[PDB]
Each structure stands twice: as C-alpha cells, then as structure tokens.
Amino acid sequence: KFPRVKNWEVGSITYDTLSAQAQQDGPCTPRRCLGSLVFPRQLLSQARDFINQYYSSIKRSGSQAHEQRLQEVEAEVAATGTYQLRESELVFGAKQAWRNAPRCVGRIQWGKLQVFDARDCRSAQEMFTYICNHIKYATNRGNLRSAITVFPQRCPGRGDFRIWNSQLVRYAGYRQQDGSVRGDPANVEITELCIQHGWTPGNGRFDVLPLLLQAPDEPPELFLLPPELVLEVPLEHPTLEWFAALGLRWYALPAVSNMLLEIGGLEFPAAPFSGWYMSTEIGTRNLCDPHRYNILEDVAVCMDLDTRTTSSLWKDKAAVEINVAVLHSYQLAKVTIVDHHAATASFMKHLENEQKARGGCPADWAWIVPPISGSLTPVFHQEMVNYFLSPAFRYQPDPW
Amino acid sequence: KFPRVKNWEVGSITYDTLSAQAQQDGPCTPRRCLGSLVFPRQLLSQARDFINQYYSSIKRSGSQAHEQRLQEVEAEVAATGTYQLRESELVFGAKQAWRNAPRCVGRIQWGKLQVFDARDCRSAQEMFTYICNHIKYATNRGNLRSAITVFPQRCPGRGDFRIWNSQLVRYAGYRQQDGSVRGDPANVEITELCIQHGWTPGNGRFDVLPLLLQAPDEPPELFLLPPELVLEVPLEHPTLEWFAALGLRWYALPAVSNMLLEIGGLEFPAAPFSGWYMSTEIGTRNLCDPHRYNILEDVAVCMDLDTRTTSSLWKDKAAVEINVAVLHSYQLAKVTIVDHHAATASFMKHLENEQKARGGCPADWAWIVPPISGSLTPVFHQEMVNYFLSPAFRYQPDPW
Ligand code: HEM
Ligand code: HEM
Ligand SMILES: C[C@H](O)[C@H](O)[C@H]1CNc2nc(N)[nH]c(=O)c2N1
Ligand SMILES: C[C@H](O)[C@H](O)[C@H]1CNc2nc(N)[nH]c(=O)c2N1
Numbered sequence: 001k002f003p004r005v006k007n008w009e010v011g012s013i014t015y016d017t018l019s020a021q022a023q024q025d026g027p028c029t030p031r032r033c034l035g036s037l038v039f040p041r042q043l044l045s046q047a048r049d050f051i052n053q054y055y056s057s058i059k060r061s062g063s064q065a066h067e068q069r070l071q072e073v074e075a076e077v078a079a080t081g082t083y084q085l086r087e088s089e090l091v092f093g094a095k096q097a098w099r100n101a102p103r104c105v106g107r108i109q110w111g112k113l114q115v116f117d118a119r120d121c122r123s124a125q126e127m128f129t130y131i132c133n134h135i136k137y138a139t140n141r142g143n144l145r146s147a148i149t150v151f152p153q154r155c156p157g158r159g160d161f162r163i164w165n166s167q168l169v170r171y172a173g174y175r176q177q178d179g180s181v182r183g184d185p186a187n188v189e190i191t192e193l194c195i196q197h198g199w200t201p202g203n204g205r206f207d208v209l210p211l212l213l214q215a216p217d218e219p220p221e222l223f224l225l226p227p228e229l230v231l232e233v234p235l236e237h238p239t240l241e242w243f244a245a246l247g248l249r250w251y252a253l254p255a256v257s258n259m260l261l262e263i264g265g266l267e268f269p270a271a272p273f274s275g276w277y278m279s280t281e282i283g284t285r286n287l288c289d290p291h292r293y294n295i296l297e298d299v300a301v302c303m304d305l306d307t308r309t310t311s312s313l314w315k316d317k318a319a320v321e322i323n324v325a326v327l328h329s330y331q332l333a334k335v336t337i338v339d340h341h342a343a344t345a346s347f348m349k350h351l352e353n354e355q356k357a358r359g360g361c362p363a364d365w366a367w368i369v370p371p372i373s374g375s376l377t378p379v380f381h382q383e384m385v386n387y388f389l390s391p392a393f394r395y396q397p398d399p400w
Numbered sequence: 401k402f403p404r405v406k407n408w409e410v411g412s413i414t415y416d417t418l419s420a421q422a423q424q425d426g427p428c429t430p431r432r433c434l435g436s437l438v439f440p441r442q443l444l445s446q447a448r449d450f451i452n453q454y455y456s457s458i459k460r461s462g463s464q465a466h467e468q469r470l471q472e473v474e475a476e477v478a479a480t481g482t483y484q485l486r487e488s489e490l491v492f493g494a495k496q497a498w499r500n501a502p503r504c505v506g507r508i509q510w511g512k513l514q515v516f517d518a519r520d521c522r523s524a525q526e527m528f529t530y531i532c533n534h535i536k537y538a539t540n541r542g543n544l545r546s547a548i549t550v551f552p553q554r555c556p557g558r559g560d561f562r563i564w565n566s567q568l569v570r571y572a573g574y575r576q577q578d579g580s581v582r583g584d585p586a587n588v589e590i591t592e593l594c595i596q597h598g599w600t601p602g603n604g605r606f607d608v609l610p611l612l613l614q615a616p617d618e619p620p621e622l623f624l625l626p627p628e629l630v631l632e633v634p635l636e637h638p639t640l641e642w643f644a645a646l647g648l649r650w651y652a653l654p655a656v657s658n659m660l661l662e663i664g665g666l667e668f669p670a671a672p673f674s675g676w677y678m679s680t681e682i683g684t685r686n687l688c689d690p691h692r693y694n695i696l697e698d699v700a701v702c703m704d705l706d707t708r709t710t711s712s713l714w715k716d717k718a719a720v721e722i723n724v725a726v727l728h729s730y731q732l733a734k735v736t737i738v739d740h741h742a743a744t745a746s747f748m749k750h751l752e753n754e755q756k757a758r759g760g761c762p763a764d765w766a767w768i769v770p771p772i773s774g775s776l777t778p779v780f781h782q783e784m785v786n787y788f789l790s791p792a793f794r795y796q797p798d799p800w
C-alpha cells in the first residue's frame with residue numbers, strides 16, 4: 001500500500017512508499033482516525049536496523065565493517081543488556097530523529113545539526129555546564145544555530161538523567177490568591193516545583209525559571225542560568241507606538257528539554273535540542289492562547305477595535321498585529337526568526353527533497369499547518385501521511 | 401476501545417463510545433494515518449440497521465410496528481432487489497446524514513432540516529422545477545433555511561438522476577487564450593460541459609452557470625436559473641472605500657448537488673442540500689485561494705501593504721479585511737451568514753449535546769478548524785475522533 005499523496009494547489013501526486021516501513025504504533029484504525037490527538041502513543045532488532053541505516057548512509061552497506069559492527073552490537077547486548085553507540089553513529093541518529101519528526105515544519109535544516117556528546121556526564125553540576133555551553137553555542141549572540149546535547153543513555157539498574165524543565169528557558173507562572181496567574185500559566189507546576197526545591201521566586205511576568213537538573217538516583221538540584229546567557233527580545237510594533245509600553249518580551253532560544261531521544265533501541269531521557277523560532281509560536285500561541293499570556297483583548301482594545309461583536313474580527317486583527325510585533329521585534333534585535341509563510345514554503349521544498357531521497361516524509365498536517373492563516377500557506381493544500389519512524393524524539397512522563 | 405478525547409483549553413475529557421459502531425472503511429491503520437486525505441474512501445443488513453435506528457428514534461423499538469417494517473423491508477428486497485422508504489423514514493435518514501457528516505461545522509442545526517420528497521420525479525424538466533422550488537424556499541429572500549430535495553433512489557436496471565453541477569449556483573470559469581481564467585477556475589470543466597451541450601457563454605467574472613440535469617438514461621439537458629431566483633451579495637468594505645470598486649460579489653445560497661445520500665443501503669445519487677454560508681468559505685477560500693479568485697495581491701496592493709517581504713504579513717492582513725468585507729456585506733444585504741468564531745463556538749455546543757445523546761460525535765479536525773485564525777477558535781484546542789456512520793452524504797464520480 002503506497003498511499004497516493006496529492007497537492008491540491010498544483011494537482012501533483014506522489015506515492016508514499018516510506019510509510020510501509022513505519023512502526024505500527026499509531027492510534028488510528030480502519031474504524032476511526034485519532035490523528036488530532038496530542039498524545040498518539042527487541043533491542044537487538046532495533047539496533048541492527050539502526051546500524052543498517054547508518055551503513056547505508058555512508059554507502060558501506062554489506063562491508064566487513066558493517067558486519068563487524070553488527071556482531072559487536074549483538075555481543076554487547078548479549079553481554080550487558082545494552083550497547084554503546086559510536087560517536088558518528090550518535091551524530092547520525094540525532095539528525096534522523098529530527099528528520100523523522102512529523103510535527104516539525106523546520107526540517108529542511110535537519111542535516112545542519114550540531115550534536116554535543118555529553119554521554120560521559122556524571123553529575124547535575126556537569127549537566128548544568130553542558131547546558132550553559134549549549135545555550136552559548138546555539139544562541140550565538142542572536143545568529144542562532146541548531147544543536148542538541150546528548151546526556152548518558154538509559155541504563156540497566158541505574159536512574160536516568162533528567163531535566164525537569166520543559167524548555168531550557170521558561171518564564172515563571174505565579175498563581176495568585178485571586179485565582180489569576182502572574183507570568184506564564186503553562187509554567188505553574190514547574191514554577192512551584194522550583195520553589196518547593198529551595199528557589200526564592202520573583203513576582204514578575206517574565207522571570208526566567210531556574211533549571212531543575214537530575215542525575216541518576218539523586219534529588220533534582222536547582223541551577224540559575226546567568227542572565228548573560230539568556231538572550232531576550234523586547235516586543236514593539238513598527239506603527240503601534242503604544243505596543244512597546246506593554247512591556248512584553250520573549251526569549252530567543254527555544255530549547256526543548258523534556259523529550260526522549262531514541263536511537264537503535266537505545267533511549268536518552270535527557271537530550272536537549274533547539275533551533276530557532278517560527279513567529280506564530282510566540283505571537284499566536286504563547287501570547288494569544290487564552291491560557292497562556294492571553295493578550296488579545298488588551299491589544300484589540302488598545303487598537304480600539306469593536307470588541308462588542310465577533311463579526312468585526314477584532315480577534316483576527318489583533319492577532320495579526322501581534323505576530324507582526326514579534327517578527328519586527330526579532331528582526332530589530334537581530335535574533336533569528338522565521339515567519340509562517342517562509343517556514344511552510346521551505347517545508348514544501350523539504351517534502352520534495354525527501355520524496356526523491358526516501359520516497360516520502362512523515363508529516364502531521366495539524367501541526368505543520370500554522371495556527372493562523374492556514375489556507376494562505378502551501379502546506380494547507382498538501383495532503384500528508386503521518387507515521388512513526390526511528391530514530392525519533394518521543395514524549396515521556398514527567399520525572400516527578 | 402473508547403478513545404479518550406480531551407479539550408486542551410479547559411482540560412475536560414470524554415470517551416467516544418460511538419466510534420466503536422462505525423464502518424471500518426477509513427484509510428488509517430496502526431502503521432500510518434491518512435486523515436488529511438481529501439478523498440478517504442448486504443442491503444438487508446444495512447436496511448435492518450436503519451429501520452432499527454428509526455424505531456429507536458420514535459421510542460418504539462421492539463414494537464409490532466418495528467417488527468412489521470423489518471419483515472416488510474426484507475420482503476421487498478427479497479422480491480425486488482431493493483425497497484422503498486416511508487416518508488417519515490426518509491426525513492429521519494436525511495437528518496442523520498447531516499448529523500453524521502464529520503466535516504460539517506454547522507451541525508448544531510441538524511434537527512432543523514426541511515426535507516423535500518422529490519422521489520416521484522419523472523423527467524429533467526420536473527427535476528428543474530423541484531430545484532427552483534428548493535432555491536426559493538431555502539433562499540427565502542435572504543433569511544436562508546436549510547433544506548434538501550431527495551430525487552428517486554438508485555434502481556436495479558435503471559439509469560440515475562444526476563445533477564452535473566457541483567452546486568446549484570456556480571460562477572462560470574472561462575479559460576482565456578493566454579492561459580488565464582476569467583471567472584472561477586474551479587468551474588472550468590462544468591463551464592465547458594455547459595457550452596458543449598448548447599449553452600452560449602457570457603465572458604463575465606460572475607456569470608451564473610446553467611444547470612445540466614440528467615434523468616435516467618437521458619443525455620443531460622440545460623436549464624437556466626431565472627436571475628430572480630438567484631440572490632447575490634455585492635461586496636464592499638466598511639472602511640476601505642475602494643473595495644466596492646473591485647466589483648466582487650458572491651451568491652447567497654450554498655447548495656451542494658454532487659454528493660450521494662445513503663440511507664439504509666439505499667442510494668440517492670441526486671439529492672441537493674443547502675444551509676447558509678460561513679464567512680471563511682467565501683472570504684478565505686473562494687476569494688483568496690491561488691486557484692480560485694486569487695485576489696490577495698490586488699487587495700494588499702490597494703491597502704498599500706509592503707508586498708515586498710513575507711514577514712510584513714501582508715497576506716494575513718488582506719485576507720482578514722476580505723473576510724471582514726464578506727461578513728459586513730452579507731449583514732448589509734441582510735443575507736444569512738455566520739463567522740468562524742460563532743460557527744466554531746456553536747460546534748463546541750453541538751459536541752456537548754452529542755456526547756450526552758450518542759456518546760460521541762464524528763468530526764474531521766482538518767475541516768472543522770477554519771482556514772484562518774485556527775488557534776483563535778475553540779475547536780483547534782479540541783481533540784476529535786473521525787469515523788463514518790450511516791446514513792451519510794458521500795462523494796461519487798462525476799457522471800460524465
Ligand atoms: C531549524 C529551526 C526550527 C524551526 C523553525 C522549528 C519549528 C518547529 C515548529 C513550528 C514546531 C511545531 C511545535 C509547536 O507548535 O510547539 C516544531 C516541532 C518540533 N521540532 Fe522543529 N524547529 C526547528 C528545529 C528543530 C530541531 C533542531 C529539532 C531537533 C533536532 C526539532 C525538533 C522538533 C520536534 C521533536 C518537534 C515536535 C515537538 C513536540 O512534539 O512537541 N526542531 N518545530
Ligand atoms: C446550517 C448552516 C450550515 C453551515 C454554517 C455549514 C457550514 C459548513 C462548513 C464551513 C463546511 C466545511 C466544508 C467546506 O469548507 O466546503 C461544511 C461542510 C459540509 N456540510 Fe455543513 N453547513 C451548514 C449546513 C449543512 C446542511 C443543511 C447539510 C446537509 C443537510 C450540510 C452538509 C455538509 C457536508 C456533507 C459537508 C462536507 C462537504 C464536503 O465534504 O465537501 N451542511 N459545512
Ligand atoms: C488537538 C490538536 O491537535 C492540538 O490542539 C494541536 C493542533 N495543532 C498544533 N500545531 C502546532 N504547531 N502546535 C500545537 O500545539 C498544536 N496543537
Ligand atoms: C489537503 C487538505 O486536507 C485539504 O486542502 C483540506 C484541508 N481542510 C479543509 N477544511 C475545510 N473546511 N474545507 C476544505 O476544503 C479543506 N481542504
């Protein structure tokens with residue numbers, strides 16, 4: 001079964017021959033589709049497959065080298081219950097994990113990833129060092145560079161290395177007596193965990209949280225990022241002179257730190273990664289979602305729009321100007337950022353590159369299509385096939 | 401398996417116990433999800449089930465009446481290869497077909513549908529009469545009322561009744577010598593079929609096509625809607641005084657006429673239905689799709705936006721004003737129209753009503769979510785389960 005995939009804008013069609021090699025762990029069946037679900041989910045066999053992928057990538061499949069690596073991997077597994085990846089294999093796997101991520105619209109840059117090997121890490125203190133270096137390299141004074149830092153793999157009879165925060169840089173969410181929240185509502189739990197672990201909080205709306213880092217079988221320890229390491233952008237609007245007076249801002253580096261990296265059957269519970277922002281992520285979701293900063297009303301009011309009726313599309317106008325504020329501000333502060341039109345246009349290219357490369361691309365339509373102006377971007381008119389290939393980035397339960 | 405369905409805005413969760421009774425004819429499998437695909441696809445057993453649904457609806461399940469109807473249906477089928485529905489059964493089935501439509505955001509009104517029985521239809525001439533009547537009742541001078549006209553079912557050894565047009569009112573699409581299209585490009589084929597059947601075309605941008613109606617085993621015949629019957633809205637903007645000068649307009653009645661209605665195993669190849677418009681359908685899709693009227697550029701330019709770069713979000717700003725044009729124009733002309741915020745908000749209520757009623761609701765996230773401001777509407781933050789229940793409206797091959 002090679003699903004026909006059609007682009008309704010140009011009428012072109014392709015056949016996804018790659019899906020037939022995916023993992024049968026999706027939530028859909030012939031009876032019902034569960035694709036809108038946020039959470040849709042032998043070591044030897046997985047390892048062998050990954051080793052095979054690796055040798056094919058360097059074009060040395062079937063070589064003595066390939067054979068040796070297979071026997072070696074099997075020996076380690078049969079002898080220890082796990083195995084050790086080689087440095088180049090790790091770099092290869094990390095890049096495929098990103099490449100394979102169905103929900104990522106920035107995958108055309110997949111081959112340009114900087115992997116930091118942090119597998120000889122021994123303490124949360126060293127963990128903090130590796131993280132500060134990651135933030136330094138990646139942030140790069142605003143000319144952001146994609147990177148990932150891989151900490152020790154999951155071990156037989158050993159606790160995991162875990163970063164409790166969901167992102168390396170997050171704003172505190174302080175729940176008020178009156179039920180409101182000062183800061184980011186999405187971060188109330190982690191904020192309260194930091195406080196409960198000894199952190200003295202700061203009553204601000206954009207207070208960068210400390211890191212709660214965990215080494216195998218240890219309580220988590222608190223670590224404060226130096227202000228100098230955390231680049232932020234103050235928000236202003238090119239024409240709405242009053243926007244700036246709102247005192248809004250956002251950090252430069254989106255670094256996801258709560259997902260698990262799986263390469264050839266091996267699991268790395270702590271393996272932070274980051275690229276750069278796509279405007280809708282901040283402008284639409286972070287700032288306009290009712291349970292996030294929730295600023296639409298104030299902005300609409302300041303724009304003096306008719307908030308009385310829904311047909312005035314006050315919400316649409318405010319949202320758009322806020323996304324404009326984010327783009328303008330990042331470009332001003334000279335911090336890397338890409339808008340949804342450019343982002344999706346590049347993904348259409350990535351899809352083309354992959355059809356020629358692997359004969360298909362795992363994509364999640366609901367996440368690829370932007371939270372605003374969906375039909376105005378080319379991906380909306382593009383049919384997609386969603387599946388789970390490996391290596392991969394996966395979700396995992398919170399460590400507490 | 402009762403899929404848990406969560407609303408990420410409020411955090412509430414439900415379990416769809418209705419999907420377990422769906423038809424296993426969807427395109428997804430545990431290996432891959434084909435939910436973004438536009439086209440995802442015994443009479444006795446189907447009939448009995450429908451009859452059972454009907455008797456449950458009137459609360460007379462297990463009655464002598466229920467039993468008689470079962471035996472009767474079976475006798476007709478065993479005797480003729482088909483069977484005839486009763487008027488009340490037809491009315492009930494048509495309403496369930498709408499209710500079951502996963503891609504319809506206007507389903508909260510499902511119970512207020514006016515079914516017109518046109519099953520005694522004998523010619524294309526009479527077919528044209530019922531259509532004009534449908535247009536009159538439904539249009540209702542601008543206070544649109546949802547309705548459907550059911551023409552004779554598909555028969556053993558007999559051609560079908562078919563309406564060649566996709567909608568009752570469509571604008572011609574005239575392909576120009578220079579490769580351009582004057583009118584609606586989506587209607588080039590039907591336009592050329594009309595011409596090919598004797599229609600003398602009209603080189604305009606908004607020329608209402610004639611109907612190409614087909615009666616069993618007949619060539620299609622052309623029929624011209626009297627201008628009087630087709631209500632249209634000229635488009636203007638509340639503030640952009642020049643918008644009107646663009647000479648844009650759209651018809652009031654969206655009446656889909658190419659879909660098949662399936663009730664208890666019976667198929668009605670001709671059974672046009674209509675409700676009223678949701679603004680995004682016209683403003684975003686019909687007017688902004690690159691292969692539709694494609695007016696973004698011109699409007700952006702007239703709004704004097706920086707068309708130079710994508711980060712100015714010129715496309716987003718024009719699109720919003722155009723949707724504003726549509727809404728304001730229909731409200732001015734006093735023609736029924738609903739905006740995406742109101743539409744999606746009503747669907748959230750429909751979902752709640754159905755959870756209580758049938759323990760679930762078949763919905764296609766990709767279609768329920770509007771083509772603009774997706775995350776600004778509550779449906780975006782709502783997980784959905786998509787499946788195919790019966791009765792239903794289905795797609796079918798074009799009759800030529
Ligand atoms: C190159 C610049 C990048 C851009 C513009 C980008 C953009 C995006 C966007 C818009 C999403 C949708 C998720 C959301 O709405 O929160 C996403 C998801 C994702 N990105 Fe990419 N990304 C970039 C780089 C990377 C890199 C370097 C990796 C890993 C090596 C990565 C891994 C992922 C994963 C795993 C997801 C899914 C996250 C989830 O499921 O919550 N991204 N990205
Ligand atoms: C009552 C006012 C109504 C509103 C506001 C409404 C709105 C919508 C919208 C926004 C869509 C998305 C499809 C598209 O973008 O073309 C849709 C689809 C659909 N509507 Fe509803 N509709 C209404 C009434 C009806 C009625 C009365 C029926 C049948 C009795 C119906 C049957 C359908 C079907 C079958 C689809 C899917 C069409 C397709 O798959 O191409 N609608 N409607
Ligand atoms: C339920 C639904 O899938 C969920 O709200 C999704 C939809 N698409 C998304 N797409 C992106 N990029 N980011 C998100 O957080 C979401 N949320
Ligand atoms: C490929 C893609 O699914 C297709 O363009 C869909 C997306 N969602 C849609 N949603 C609605 N309401 N109407 C449409 O025509 C479409 N088209």
Ligand SMILES: N=C(NO)NCCC[C@H](N)C(=O)O
Pocket residue numbers: 167254255256273274275276277278281282285286
């Ligand atoms: N671009 C990335 N990662 O590198 N996106 C991941 C999610 C980020 C999230 N939407 C935020 O803005 O907080």
Ligand SMILES: N=C(NO)NCCC[C@H](N)C(=O)O
Pocket residue numbers: 567654655656673674675676677678681682686
């Ligand atoms: N409301 C309905 N049907 O009743 N919508 C579906 C058809 C409308 C179609 N998208 C058009 O505007 O051409």
Ligand SMILES: [Zn+2]
Pocket residue numbers: 028029032033034035428429432433434435
């Ligand atoms: Zn699916």
